[PDB]
Amino acid sequence: MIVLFVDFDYFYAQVEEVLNPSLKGKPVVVCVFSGRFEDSGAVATANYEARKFGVKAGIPIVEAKKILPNAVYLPMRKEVYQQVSSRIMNLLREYSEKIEIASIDEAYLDISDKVRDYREAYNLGLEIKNKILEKEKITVTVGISKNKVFAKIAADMAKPNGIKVIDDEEVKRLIRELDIADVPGIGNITAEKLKKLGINKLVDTLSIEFDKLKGMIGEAKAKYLISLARDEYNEPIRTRVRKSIGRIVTMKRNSRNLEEIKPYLFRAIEESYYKLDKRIPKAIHVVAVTEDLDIVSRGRTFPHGISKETAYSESVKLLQKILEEDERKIRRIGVRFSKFI
DNA sequence: TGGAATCCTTCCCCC
DNA sequence: GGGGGAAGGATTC
Numbered sequence: 001m002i003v004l005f006v007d008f009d010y011f012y013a014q015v016e017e018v019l020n021p022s023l024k025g026k027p028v029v030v031c032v033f034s035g036r037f038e039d040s041g042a043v044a045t046a047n048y049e050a051r052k053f054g055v056k057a058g059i060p061i062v063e064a065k066k067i068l069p070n071a072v073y074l075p076m077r078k079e080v081y082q083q084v085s086s087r088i089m090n091l092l093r094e095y096s097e098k099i100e101i102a103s104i105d106e107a108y109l110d111i112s113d114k115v116r117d118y119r120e121a122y123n124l125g126l127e128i129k130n131k132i133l134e135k136e137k138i139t140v141t142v143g144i145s146k147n148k149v150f151a152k153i154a155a156d157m158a159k160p161n162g163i164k165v166i167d168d169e170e171v172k173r174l175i176r177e178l179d180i181a182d183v184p185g186i187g188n189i190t191a192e193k194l195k196k197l198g199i200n201k202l203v204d205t206l207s208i209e210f211d212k213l214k215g216m217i218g219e220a221k222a223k224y225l226i227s228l229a230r231d232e233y234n235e236p237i238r239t240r241v242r243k244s245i246g247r248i249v250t251m252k253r254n255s256r257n258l259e260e261i262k263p264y265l266f267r268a269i270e271e272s273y274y275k276l277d278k279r280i281p282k283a284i285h286v287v288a289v290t291e292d293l294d295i296v297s298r299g300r301t302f303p304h305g306i307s308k309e310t311a312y313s314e315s316v317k318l319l320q321k322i323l324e325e326d327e328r329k330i331r332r333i334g335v336r337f338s339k340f341i
Numbered sequence: 342t343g344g345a346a347t348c349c350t351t352c353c354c355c356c
Numbered sequence: 357g358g359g360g361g362a363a364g365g366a367t368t369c
């Protein structure tokens with residue numbers, strides 16, 4: 001099996017660059033302004049000229065501004081990047097039918113049939129990078145290996161504007177060599193839990209009683225890691241299905257007054273129902289980010305779909321449960337819909 | 342900030 | 357005991 005993975009370089013900033021080419025060469029910061037004070041919000045992403053000074057996804061816009069007061073700061077336009085995304089995904093379909101769209105900027109391809117080895121794959125690699133650059137003026141990084149996980153690791157190593165092959169000899173090398181934190185699916189919380197068990201490299205996973213692993217990081221993530229370390233990971237490329245739709249918004253001020261929270265909640269419902277587009281959910285969840293940035297949710301599944309009218313009334317009940325059961329103020333409020341007919 | 346998948350624990354109903 | 361589904365969270369990208 002041969003998997004080819006594509007990650008679109010600094011994606012939101014690059015689209016902004018493409019749509020306004022004068023940006024190129026400058027540091028560009030795509031921001032999610034939250035509207036509480038001037039420059040409240042976070043950075044969605046930044047191009048490389050900004051990242052090399054620490055300006056990156058996650059940091060507050062006020063912090064980015066302190067480091068690069070003269071960078072170019074743009075509000076995020078998700079819809080635009082999304083439409084550009086779709087176009088690029090279409091290009092890749094013309095290279096394989098088996099395609100796993102992982103994110104707005106990530107896709108895996110099963111090119112087992114279309115190619116014979118890591119020479120030919122490298123070429124198809126370049127064919128694709130070039131086609132996407134030609135048709136869309138967008139640079140991407142390509143990772144190629146024996147399974148998804150490694151395909152992605154290859155890309156991470158080779159970015160930006162790279163293309164990289166992790167063969168079999170390297171796979172075996174990285175199983176011993178690679179820091180387990182750099183393995184997809186392993187965040188700060190799992191990486192620290194693995195340190196406490198002495199797992200610092202993928203191979204260490206074999207020096208443990210399976211139940212102690214399951215006991216710590218959970219069963220599924222334990223099997224994941226073990227199969228990887230055993231050169232045995234082999235999950236297939238599959239169409240991912242939209243299972244949930246929603247939208248959460250930031251309120252100007254933290255609050256506990258019901259009538260103060262409702263309009264944000266209603267706006268959240270509205271945007272969500274538009275996004276549904278002929279989809280009909282039987283589940284609603286009201287989600288709230290408390291003032292200490294903790295996340296509380298109350299929900300309900302119906303035996304039928306939910307009309308906009310029903311969602312309005314039910315969301316207020318769930319919002320009321322939340323207030324009744326959590327004493328903190330609400331920072332962010334919103335909804336998810338799920339269990340589509 | 343923020344969308345959404347996947348997972349995990351718990352509770353519950355009931356053969 | 358365990359299938360089976362909900363609910364509320366935890367974790368990740």
Ligand SMILES: Nc1ncnc2c1ncn2[C@H]1C[C@H](O)[C@@H](COP(=O)(O)OP(=O)(O)OP(=O)(O)O)O1
Pocket residue numbers: 007008009010011012013043044045046057058104105159160343
């Ligand atoms: N923490 C975040 N907050 C908001 N949006 C994000 C965040 N991280 C990523 N995104 C968005 C914007 C990104 O361009 C896009 C893809 O993320 P990602 O693949 O990790 O990096 P990137 O596209 O910005 O470039 P690169 O992979 O070269 O670092 O999704």
Ligand SMILES: [Ca+2]
Pocket residue numbers: 007008009010011105
């Ligand atoms: Ca990318």
Ligand SMILES: [Ca+2]
Pocket residue numbers: 181182183186187188
């Ligand atoms: Ca990591």
